[PDB]
Symmetry: C2
């Protein structure tokens, strides 16, 4: 249901959040008309684990705010 | 094939690695006679992402060193 356009939006919205060093992985699927997705973002290896958690939270908020069809979004981080 | 005894060993071995603040989650399965497993360890929220990666690596090494039947082990971290 025009999945690539939604994936583009997800990556674009995540990259606009302070502290994100790219989108490493994104898997999105439709459950009916809703998107369920799992993402890994890059972060500064020198951020604290707490800071990385904060960035992930921020990404979840930004992405879900911008893309109303998302009903589930898990965001994790890795050093980049 | 005496899975609980192997799970106990996995958790015990992970908890002996410097920087581990418990085992948050462990899923192990047999693929034939071999174990494939995925684990989440707790770490100090004030560790850097790099330090958490180092701890995860150390856990993978310690666990696989001690439990020879493990053929695949993924270790991630979360603040605790």
């Amino acid at each position: 249901s025009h999945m690539e356009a939604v994936q583009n939006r997800i990556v674009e919205a995540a990259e606009r959040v302070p502290g994100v060093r790219g989108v490493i992985h994104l898997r999105a699927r439709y459950v009916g008309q809703d998107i369920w997705a799992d993402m890994i973002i890059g972060v500064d290896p020198e951020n604290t684990v707490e800071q990385a958690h904060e960035i992930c939270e921020a990404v979840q908020a930004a992405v879900c705010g911008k893309i109303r069809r998302i009903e589930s979004l898990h965001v994790s981080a890795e050093a980049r």
